[PDB]
Amino acid sequence: KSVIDGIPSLESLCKRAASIRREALQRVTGRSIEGLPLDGFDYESMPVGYIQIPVGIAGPLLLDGYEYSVPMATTEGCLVASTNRGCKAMFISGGATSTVLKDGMTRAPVVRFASARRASELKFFLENPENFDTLAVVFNRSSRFARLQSVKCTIAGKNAYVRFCCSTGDAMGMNMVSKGVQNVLEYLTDDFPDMDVIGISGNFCSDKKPAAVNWIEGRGKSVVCEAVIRGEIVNKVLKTSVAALVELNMLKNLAGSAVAGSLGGFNAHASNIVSAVFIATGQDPAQNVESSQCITMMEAINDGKDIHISVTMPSIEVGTVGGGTQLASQSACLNLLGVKGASTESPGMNARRLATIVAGAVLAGELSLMSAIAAGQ
Amino acid sequence: KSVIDGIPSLESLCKRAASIRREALQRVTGRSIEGLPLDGFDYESMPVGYIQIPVGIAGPLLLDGYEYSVPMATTEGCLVASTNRGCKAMFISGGATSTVLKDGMTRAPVVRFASARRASELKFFLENPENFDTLAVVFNRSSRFARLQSVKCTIAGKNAYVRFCCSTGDAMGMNMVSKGVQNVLEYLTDDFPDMDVIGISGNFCSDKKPAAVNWIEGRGKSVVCEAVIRGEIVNKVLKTSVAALVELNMLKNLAGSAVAGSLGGFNAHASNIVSAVFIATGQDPAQNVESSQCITMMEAINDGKDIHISVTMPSIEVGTVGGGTQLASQSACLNLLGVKGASTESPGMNARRLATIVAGAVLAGELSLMSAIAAGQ
Amino acid sequence: KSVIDGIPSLESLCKRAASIRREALQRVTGRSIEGLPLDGFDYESMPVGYIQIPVGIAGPLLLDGYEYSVPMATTEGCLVASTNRGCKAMFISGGATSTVLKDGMTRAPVVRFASARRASELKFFLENPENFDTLAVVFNRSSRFARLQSVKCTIAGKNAYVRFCCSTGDAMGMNMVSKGVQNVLEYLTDDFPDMDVIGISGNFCSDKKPAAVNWIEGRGKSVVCEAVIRGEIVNKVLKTSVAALVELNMLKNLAGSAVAGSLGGFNAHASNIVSAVFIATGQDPAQNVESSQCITMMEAINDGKDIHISVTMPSIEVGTVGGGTQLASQSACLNLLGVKGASTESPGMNARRLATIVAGAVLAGELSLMSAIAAGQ
Amino acid sequence: KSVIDGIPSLESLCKRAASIRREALQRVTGRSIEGLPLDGFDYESMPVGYIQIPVGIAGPLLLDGYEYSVPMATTEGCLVASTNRGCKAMFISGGATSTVLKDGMTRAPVVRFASARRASELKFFLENPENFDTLAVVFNRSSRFARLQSVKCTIAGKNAYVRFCCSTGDAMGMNMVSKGVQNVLEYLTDDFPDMDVIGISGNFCSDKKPAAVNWIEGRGKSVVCEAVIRGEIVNKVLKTSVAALVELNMLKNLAGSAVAGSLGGFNAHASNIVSAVFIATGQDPAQNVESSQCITMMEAINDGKDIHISVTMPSIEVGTVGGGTQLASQSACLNLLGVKGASTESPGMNARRLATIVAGAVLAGELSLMSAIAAGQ
């Protein structure tokens, strides 16, 4: 208790230190943090406690022939219940099919020269296919798992925003892409000694921000997920018509988002589902900003009898290794999905499958909410 | 254990039911969820468990003359440590000043008519100042706390996207604005019996999506937060110059975001800080998407000797009543900030103060990360 | 010819001076400008000649009960021919109906203070309804025709972007809104002597740039134009189906523009028609950038038998007085439309009608090109 | 005159026909088009006349070591005069340096399949480097000058937006890229007989619309143009300081455009200069919408003594062959610049040089207007 004393004049004595700081904070603050638990968490895995978010289960989600019980960390029973209704409707409709369209994490440092002419010489150097193997060798010293895929260099005046894209195995891969970029920036001091490195991120990555570069180019896992709901199931189960769902999608998710001046927001509530699964599975909750990017498409097929439904999500940023993924509670949620840790089969397959599951759960959420709106007409 | 049996052929027997579903899920799934705790949570407050996120403390944050210990729910000690460094630098610089520029939650139903001419008659009706008091009376039956502020009606063909804005006291207010919109849509069946209500949300709100309507118009709390760091402190404490910080802000947060095609992403990592405080204080983590919207400005003042730093955040969506805010752990975090529950002084003052604290913590995070980048040159 | 001499050692001796500069330019340049005419133009109305663009006629365009022969200044006979086909199809379909949703030109100076707190005091002052009549009196000294409608002040750090909106009679009104803004900025030196005026335009207007402020808020004339094409005419004349046109609109103008990351570009070729009419009628060709902003909507009506078609154009910037509108050739084109000069009925009615004609011609162009694409399937 | 009769009962008897239609139009319309000339134009090169726009000269513009007299087709003497002031300031500052960063015209058809899985198979086929030479051979039958550079396929649900990029020699190249796309779509019916071609343009090109695809990826000529103005010239000639110009650029062209929600509009008035040169040189005036895309950068160099100024313009769409470029008056304006017709040296060099001249004239306009604003403080 004398430790709490010196309040007078943290960075520690983990749990013992955790306990000391709590009393110091309540004493100095004058505020009770009574309902914030200390006990029940391994702090070895400036902590003062931990918050609790309840995990609900949505499913079974039938995806590429497999059944998933989707963990959703949220306050609202109504989000789990609604996603669950979407899972049931797709389960009797042959389930969902996912396709991974692209897989690579990006980092875009800003560097500058004395002229745009000189900056353009870095661009032409880096984008010359003959130089790729050398840049990749330098980059890939980053890690066992780092594989450079591309370098795109955008010039703005005497500045270059140099977008590196690489695979990172089952890691989300922000630390890996960064080490790789540092290798290439050090290697470049030979042919480019006039280069000033302004920052490891020039906001062209673009990390934890909505950006057209990510919508156009993708970032992390670019995924499309689709299902066909038969007319008879749209009528009997979803209590609407093919026509009403197609029209609502066009008026709400396409025209409405257009009128609102949306960037990547051509969907009903992808953000709700992405956030809940992200927190359950120990992802970075700040990457929900670009991971929720989605265009929902609903089209009449088979002479207007059935509906083709899809979500296209260009920038799902997930990993199954590192960060919050290796805490006990979040690890258990990845294990439920069968994507805990690195892939046995081939590096990155677990993080890819996680991305397809997010997209499948988003498709279920879109079908359920859009059906409820349409049925309520 | 026979309950787990009928697996054969949730919506319950709260904790007792919670326990039953867990065994049913592990048995049916074939997957261990061993490290997901059941015990230690009041389920009365389809749950199968809860995840734990550790809470670190950033501060003291000196804001409008008061000192705050900012709870940050995150995996990374480095985010708390960095935000803490920003708090110290501002604490010796006279602290931060916040200004609330606007406060109101929005909902934008999509309705349609047989013609754009007819849709325009709803627009001119709703936007006619003589009709406001009648619309407000109908709207404000929503709640003791519901106060209609404005109605803006955007026409797209024969469709109207009708944006309602109202104060909601200390509630985030999505349910309140929605009840109010339903009152007005029912009242309108008199003068507009030809009106088809397509949906309570036409994506023009715009909720949990990045949209220019929210950047231009605001949503929830629109806040600016500012501080002045003296040259001598920029040199000795932040290990950089006024010139280097102003140039990095222009090249990274302004030019870089512009080159990336950003919408509201004119900042270094507002999303990181917003997400951590949002989860600590039981906010909706999906509203991080628009609540992270921020332009960071850094300008040389006093003949280039000092630096004026600010964040302008048009759409911070927070409440201190309802949702996750009334769970034990998240309640304790609001109580630390002194903004638990409804305002004693005047309804909405707690949710406003919470918004200013988020903006202050974001300013600290921006100063710390931008200083570290600049100092690393 | 000695004048051309002093080539030796812009701003003049109008036609006489025009002729002198031409020889000086060919002599000094070494380049023949033989095919650029000098004769045939009244230079009294550093000119070296004039270019010629041929004027084709599209119509009759049946709009709000009147018939128009639409002058289109363009190189391509195919653009006039296609727009003409659209006019015919609408002419047998009952013609088009326009609605003016808003009419006001904007200017947004950037001003700054020592703090965001102080900048916010200008915001609250300017947006306080009690101050409006005083601001309007100061503003409206601008002109006989200047009528202030609104002032919106956006704060970014210690800077204010102050958006003034006013009616300007039949003038496009950029010079009028500017004089009015100067009056208000001078009047404000009393209560705001600390205010630094950084520029008369802070790019928030936003003039001759694509900006979400103009898409969301409008600028100049905000217009919707609509028509109904009967199934039998879609089949027999346009050689397609209602279903094919609705699907093409959703896949091309909505989904396609969304995938492209469009701002206000939810249309097939509004820009082609706007540019041609703008140049014919002596408008500012640089304002084509925001005047082409358009969402094209095509919806099945009457149990899928007929198609409702519309264009919604939030920022058509036109005048019938001042600028190029009072040159001989462009005056003749306005006179063809019956909108030459100021309105006899009421100030602004000619410029409003011109805006509805542009929207009608755009609707015709959209119907023709979209029908040709659909029919080509 | 009996021809005008049958008014009774567009497509012709060129000038003879031109004359007939004029009387028919005045008779039927009741409107005089007296000041629209018929005589003075070769109609062999549904015309009813031609408009006249006066051509002013800006320069000399010193660009990559050469001097240019820049033809500007505009109503306002003040735009030519202002651009002229910018040319003088750069002329005594060592002139401007341009760099072409990319050169290729794009077309993006929308095609669809029964599934996103099947659509993804077209993507992987088209983006497989092993298939490139076959696709290029099929594409390049388009023309002597058509050279396929890249194919990027974006999937949205069961739809593919397939972006083809090719060089087109000195032609703007919209017709060439289109023939090439038709070759590839016909060749694909072998391996993809299930493919439905919805349209030759799916708005992902993106032609005559502001789109992030063009800002991020470029379209036509991507150009950067730069100059250094010495402190002594900023003081004595431009009547401002290096500090004031850098601050105005950051507050107006960067922060202001950001606050406005601009896409590619990070500049003062690029649109004004682009439109004037486009019309003078017979370019497509509708392509001003994307050709005006520009970020203006102004940075203090040499210990704050001098200013580095640049424009980066990702999508300048110009040709010197075909369209309006081969009319007499517009041909004379290209000839003044020394870029009339196809390149003798190497195909495309004339259209590239034209693009660098536009960028140089835009830089001059930006320097002049920004200096005038700064000097007026």
Author numbering:
A (entry chain AAA), B (entry chain AAA), C (entry chain AAA), D (entry chain AAA): 177 to 182, 184 to 186, 189 to 191, 193, 196 to 227, 235 to 566
Provide the authors' original text about this structure:
HMGR (3-hydroxy-3-methylglutaryl-coenzyme A reductase) is the rate limiting enzyme of the eukaryotic mevalonate pathway successfully targeted by statins to treat hypercholesterolemia in humans. Here, we present the crystal structure of a HMGR from Arabidopsis thaliana (AtHMG1) which exhibits a wider active site than previously determined structures from different species. By contrast, the conserved extracellular domain of AtHMG1 shares ~54% sequence identity with HsHMGCR and strictly conserved catalytic residues.
To develop plant-specific statins and mitigate off-target effects, we solved the crystal structure of the core domain of apo AtHMG1 and in complex with pitavastatin to resolutions of 1.9 and 2.1 Å, respectively, in space groupI 41 2 2. Closer inspection of the statin-binding pocket revealed two substitutions in AtHMG1 with respect to HsHMGCR located at the hydrophobic CoA binding region of the active site pocket, specifically, Ile562/Leu857 and Ile389/Val683 in AtHMG1/HsHMGCR respectively. Furthermore, a plant conserved Val to Pro (Pro236/Val530 A. thaliana/human) substitution at the start of the Lβ1-strand is the likely cause of conformational flexibility and lack of electron density in the Nα4-Lβ1 loop adjacent to the active site-delineating Lβ2-Lα1 loop. This flexibility results in the loss of a type II β-turn found within the HsHMGCR Lβ2-Lα1 loop that is stabilised by hydrogen bonding between a conserved Glu (Glu234/Glu528 AtHMG1/HsHMGCR) and a Cys backbone amine (Cys267/Cys561 AtHMG1/HsHMGCR). The differences in the architecture of AtHMG1 that allowed for species selectivity largely arise from an unusual orientation of the Lβ2-Lα1 loop that is likely the result of increased flexibility in the neighbouring Nα4-Lβ1 loop. The atypical orientation of the Lβ2-Lα1 loop in AtHMG1 disrupts the hydrogen bonding network formed between the catalytic residues Glu265/Lys397/Asn461/Asp473 (HsHMGCR Glu559/Lys691/Asn755/Asp767), thereby retaining only those hydrogen bonds that stabilise the catalytic Lys via the adjacent Asn and Asp residues. Glu265 is not in a favourable position to hydrogen bond to either the substrate thioester oxygen or the adjacent Asp473, which based on HsHMGCR in silico simulations (HsHMGCR Glu559 and Asp767) might be expected to hydrogen bond and stabilise the mevaldyl-CoA intermediate.
